[PDB]
Design a protein around this ligand. Structure first.
Ligand SMILES: Nc1ncnc2c1ncn2[C@@H]1O[C@H](COP(=O)(O)OP(=O)(O)O)[C@@H](O)[C@H]1O
Lengths: 322, 48, 97, 193, 435
């Protein structure tokens, strides 16, 4: 198990199944050895991935829960649901400490900024909103998307937020001044999922695309976007250019992310498969028949060699990496 | 029947010659300008 | 973005069309108060420089004269008055005849 | 001025049509050439930026391509000028005025699109911080033609109004002040090296 | 004159000029008096000319004169010398621009160029999809000094369509001789391609208004601007029309007074030999994607042709108005097979036959009205495939639920019915919440 090279393997460790509805998103706890998964039955079930046992269900949402996210410390859990509300959960006591309204329609994403003092959310009313963690007040409203915004994800340093939407485009925004830094459009269909590039990958990407070293020393933040045209495009945010397109998925790409070591790309799609991509050679190494139905989301643990994948079959699967 | 005439022209050629006139034509030329630039082409005269 | 006086002075300094070979006079016809005239303290001094906030500095060509045509100086400070050549036109200069 | 003096003359009534014709010709010549000289200068110091810098393609790709398109059109227009370099033929060139106006607008847009590049390039030579964006572009683009850089040295140094160059304009032999006082470098600096 | 320009040292000589003029006169009489009739009537006119003329004629015992052009040297040359068996690039298989040369194609090319060079209006008459638009565009490619502008006439078409086209592409300029309507660009001729000239409705007094308007532009060289009742003269404008035969339903015979100015050329459906040549070339170009299949180019094309022929005789406009079959369907056939073959690295012959069958179903069965015709189409597709492709897995290639989709894969591949049903159920579940 090379500490920066493991990839998941077909023999699954556990198949956790307690949800009564399609599992929407799955995330790892940054600190504790515990994992969280939200579903469409307005439930957020918490499992321990070392021994594969259910622990507790977080409820309070009225409709299907679409996104869940942790802060850096792992003490708060931000979740959003189809009932137009965003709930903040005290993860120590497991009570919803604050509920936030203000989105005019379905809220399809949520994310906590790296500083941990703000929550960024994206909703079907074509708007992104920023909320104070302490007070729960809406403070900023990013507009400019022409369609339903599906996800929003800030970078490592929290100065930029990327948003994908049904309007065929991915918009990169500057949080400080609310402007649209970039508008990336090459997908021929709706963009489903996006992901930022970890620092440990920049150099690799720089030699993967053949991009020459900039005199500044910062290669520029790199973004990914899987879309319903069965393609995963990786972009240079600084220049607005599509560094590469990755093809090989048989259906809509639902989740995409980097290996924690920044050597591979992990993605999942409705073709019932989880694919591991060698973006060095712009080709897919490994394919896993992860689930018996659509795969909706995946998470890759920062340190431990585990991959958690949710699916519409109401089953969350844990994969050891070897 | 004029509806069917416009549909005939649009389906056959992809454009209606008499649809944009006057200020509409200038406005359309404007949006075509930023469309071509914003896609990646440079087209200055109206015919291209 | 250059202002009116900045644009005029920059065009004269560049001398694309042979401005430096001419006699350029810039006549400020109107009221004088410190708010707009104190920015000319370096221009009217021995520095002969107009300093902009962007760090740019424009040197006054020797063929350029800064002229002010004013009816009074009840608001101008001593800094402006000491920096300029005074010419006093009493009303008796232009008689009715 | 001469034709206007003819206009004020009493005998000008029999020379109405041709005097007004040359009014029209000369006025169109000025209208074309006043914007044309500016277009020429802007292209001159823009091609220097877009050719002498290797990183401008990576950092400013879209505006790079904009400039190659504009530059190819400008070179085509200049070739058309060169084939018939008489003033009336280029004056009578179809759509020369509108083409020149479009070139001026495009060059202005490209120049205003270079702010970040110039701001970062100021870091290499700190004295560039006291030079405006227009003059900085002129300095960087016209680095090869050091003859026209003598007017910018007064904005960079306390008393270096101009520099002394050899006949080849390739080795800096010294500097000069406004008053004509000169300092001769013990080891002259080679621009070619 | 062009020959003399090309040979300044050796101008055109009188005896060779006389030979050239005689041969070209026979050729022009033949292509003027029979260009608007079938092949048999052209052959009959050629035989009559041979029987009555004295001009030297080709000595071929059976080849009709209409197959011979008049070389500038002053001697008959067979048109077949200008029809080479080309090899189309695999990426240009059945592309709209691509024209496979053919005897009829080159003859009509030459006649169309001859008429267009004079800026003389002309009409192409023939069955729909026969190749009139293709022939006109091929002719216009050899004349760089014209744009074609497409107008599509209909039963409700009246001159304001031509007025809007003139407004867009031309301008009215005031000259001392009057108002002149000229194209916005210069030096370069506008050609209005009116695709359905004989569709415009004829009033209860036997007149089509747009036909009269076109006749007035053609004969008198202008029209009347009705806003100020001003005569406007056309400049650098040409008219080319296309139409189905007047006997076809919905089509009206044109006015004789209009017809006297417009020569008419009849472009029939290509014969089985011509279809075989064209689509054999297309199939040879296409099948180079998969080398192992290259030996199946000649049957498949033949198979295609055979099936097409049967459809064209089985379903006619007598039964339903839309039962129209043309070479356009075979072009779409080749395009669809090529699109299905592009992403595949290799493919057995049974899969090729299945793709062929699916394309045949999508092109010839989707428009059928009652069930019996669709049963006929299925059975005859099976019979044709068996006849032209023996010794293949009948069940593996003609499994009846023939479905092709790229919903379950990155490429266009056959899909099982049950998997497609489950996937469509899931997609509908998403569709309900989103749309
Ligand atoms: N010799 C040929 N080479 C290439 N394609 C041909 C040839 N003959 C016929 N075709 C096909 O037939 C079709 C011609 O239809 P078209 O010219 O549009 O008919 P119409 O002019 O009556 O509308 C084209 O799609 C073309 O692919």
């Amino acid at each position: 198990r090379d500490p920066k090279e493991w990839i998941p393997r077909p023999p699954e460790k556990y198949a956790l199944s307690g949800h009564r509805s399609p599992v929407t998103r799955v995330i790892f706890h940054p600190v504790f050895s515990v994992m969280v998964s939200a579903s469409e039955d307005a439930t957020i079930k918490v499992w321990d991935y070392e021994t594969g046992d259910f622990e507790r269900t977080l409820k309070g949402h009225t409709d299907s829960v679409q996104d869940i996210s942790f802060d850096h410390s792992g003490k708060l859990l931000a979740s959003c649901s189809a009932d137009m509300t965003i709930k903040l959960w005290d993860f120590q006591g497991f009570e919803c400490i604050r509920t936030m309204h203000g989105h005019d329609h379905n809220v399809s994403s949520v994310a906590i900024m790296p500083n941990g003092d703000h929550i960024v959310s994206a909703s079907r009313d074509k708007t992104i909103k920023m909320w104070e963690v302490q007070t729960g007040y809406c403070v900023k409203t990013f507009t400019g998307h022409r369609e339903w915004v599906r996800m929003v994800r800030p970078n490592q340093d929290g100065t930029l937020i990327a948003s994908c939407s049904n309007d065929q485009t991915v918009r990169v925004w500057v949080v400080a001044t609310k402007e649209c830094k970039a508008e990336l459009r090459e997908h021929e269909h709706v963009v489903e999922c996006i992901s930022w590039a970890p620092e440990s990958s920049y150099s690799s990407i720089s030699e993967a695309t053949g991009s020459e070293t900039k005199k500044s020393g910062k290669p520029g933040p790199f973004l990914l976007s899987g879309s319903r045209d069965k393609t995963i495009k990786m972009w240079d945010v600084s220049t607005g250019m599509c560094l590469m397109t990755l093809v090989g998925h048989d259906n809509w790409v639902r989740g995409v992310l980097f290996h924690s070591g920044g050597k591979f790309i992990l993605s999942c799609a409705d073709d019932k498969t989880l694919r591991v991509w060698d973006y060095k050679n712009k080709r897919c190494m490994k394919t896993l028949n992860a689930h018996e139905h659509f795969v909706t989301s995946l998470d890759f643990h920062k340190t431990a060699p585990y991959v958690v994948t949710g699916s519409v079959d109401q089953t969350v699967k844990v994969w050891e990496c070897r | 029947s004029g509806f069917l005439e416009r549909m005939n022209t649009l389906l056959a050629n992809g454009e209606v010659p008499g649809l944009f006139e006057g200020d509409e034509y200038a406005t359309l030329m404007t949006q075509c300008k930023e469309g071509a630039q914003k896609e990646g082409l440079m087209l200055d005269s109206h015919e291209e | 973005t250059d202002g009116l006086f900045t644009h005029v002075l920059r065009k004269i300094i560049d001398s694309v069309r042979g401005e430096l070979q001419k006699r350029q006079w810039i006549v400020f016809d109107g009221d004088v108060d410190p708010e707009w005239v104190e920015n000319l303290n370096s221009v009217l001094d021995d520095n002969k420089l107009l300093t902009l906030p962007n760090g740019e500095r424009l040197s006054l060509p020797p063929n350029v004269r800064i002229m002010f045509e004013v009816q009074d100086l009840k608001y101008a400070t001593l800094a402006t008055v000491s920096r300029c050549g005074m010419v006093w036109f009493s009303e008796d200069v232009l008689s009715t005849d | 001025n001469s034709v206007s003096a003819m206009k004020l003359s009493p005998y000008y009534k029999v020379f109405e049509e041709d005097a007004l014709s040359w009014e029209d010709k000369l006025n169109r010549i000025m209208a074309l050439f006043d914007v044309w000289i500016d277009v020429q200068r802007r292209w001159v110091y823009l091609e220097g930026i877009f050719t002498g810098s290797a990183d401008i393609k990576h950092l400013l790709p879209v505006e790079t391509q904009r400039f190659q398109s504009i530059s190819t059109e400008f070179l085509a227009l200049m070739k058309k000028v060169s084939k018939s370099p008489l003033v009336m033929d280029v004056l009578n060139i179809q759509g020369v005025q509108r083409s020149l106006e479009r070139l001026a607008d495009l060059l202005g847009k490209i120049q205003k699109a270079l702010g970040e590049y110039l701001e970062r390039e100021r870091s290499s030579f700190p004295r560039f911080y006291f030079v405006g964006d227009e003059d900085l572009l002129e300095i960087i683009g016209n680095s090869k033609n050091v003859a026209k850089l003598q007017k910018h040295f007064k904005k960079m140094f306390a008393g270096v109004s101009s520099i002394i160059l050899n006949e080849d304009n390739s080795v800096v032999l010294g500097i000069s002040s406004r008053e004509g006082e000169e300092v001769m470098f013990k080891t002259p600096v080679s621009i070619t090296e | 004159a062009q020959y003399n320009a090309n040979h300044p040292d050796f101008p055109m000589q009188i005896e060779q000029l006389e030979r050239y003029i005689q041969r070209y006169l026979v050729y022009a009489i033949l292509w003027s008096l029979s260009g608007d009739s079938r092949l048999k009537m052209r052959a009959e006119l050629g035989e009559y000319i041979r029987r009555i003329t004295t001009v030297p004629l080709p000595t071929a015992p059976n080849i009709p004169i209409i197959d011979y052009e008049v070389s500038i040297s002053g001697e008959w040359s067979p048109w077949q010398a200008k029809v080479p068996q080309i090899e189309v690039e695999t990426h240009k298989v059945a592309a709209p621009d691509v024209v496979v040369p053919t005897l009829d194609t080159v003859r009509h090319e030459a006649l169309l160029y001859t008429w267009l060079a004079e800026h003389k209006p002309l009409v192409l008459c023939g069955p729909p999809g026969s190749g009139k638009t293709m022939t006109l565009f091929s002719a216009l490619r050899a004349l760089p000094d014209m744009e074609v502008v497409g107008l599509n006439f209909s039963s409700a078409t009246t001159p304001e369509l031509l007025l809007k086209t003139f407004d867009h592409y031309c301008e009215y300029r005031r000259t001392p001789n009057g108002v002149v309507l000229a194209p916005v660009q210069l030096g370069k001729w506008l050609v209005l391609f009116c695709d359905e000239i004989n569709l415009p409705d004829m009033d209860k007094y036997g007149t089509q208004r747009v036909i009269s308007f076109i006749r007035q532009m053609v004969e008198h060289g202008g029209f009347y601007r009705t806003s100020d009742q001003t005569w406007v003269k056309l400049e650098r404008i040409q008219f080319v029309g296309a139409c189905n035969p007047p006997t076809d339903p919905g089509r009206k015979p044109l006015s004789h007074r209009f017809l006297r100015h417009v020569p008419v050329v009849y472009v029939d459906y290509p014969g089985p030999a011509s279809l075989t040549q064209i689509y054999g070339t297309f199939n040879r170009a296409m099948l180079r994607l998969i080398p192992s299949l290259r030996t199946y180019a000649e049957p498949l094309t033949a198979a295609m042709v055979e099936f097409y022929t049967m459809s064209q005789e089985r379903f006619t406009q007598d039964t339903q108005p839309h039962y129209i079959y043309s070479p356009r369907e075979m072009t779409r056939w080749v395009r669809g097979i090529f699109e299905a073959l592009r992403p595949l690295e290799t493919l057995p012959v049974e899969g090729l036959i299945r793709i062929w069958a699916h394309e045949a179903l999508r092109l010839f069965q989707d428009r059928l009205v009652e069930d019996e015709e669709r049963r006929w189409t299925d059975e005859n597709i099976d019979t044709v495939a068996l006849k032209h492709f023996p010794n293949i897995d009948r069940e593996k290639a003609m499994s009846r639920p023939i479905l092709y989709s790229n919903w379950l894969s990155k490429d266009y591949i056959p899909v099982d019915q049950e998997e497609l049903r489950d996937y469509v159920k899931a997609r509908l579940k998403v569709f309900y919440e989103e749309e």
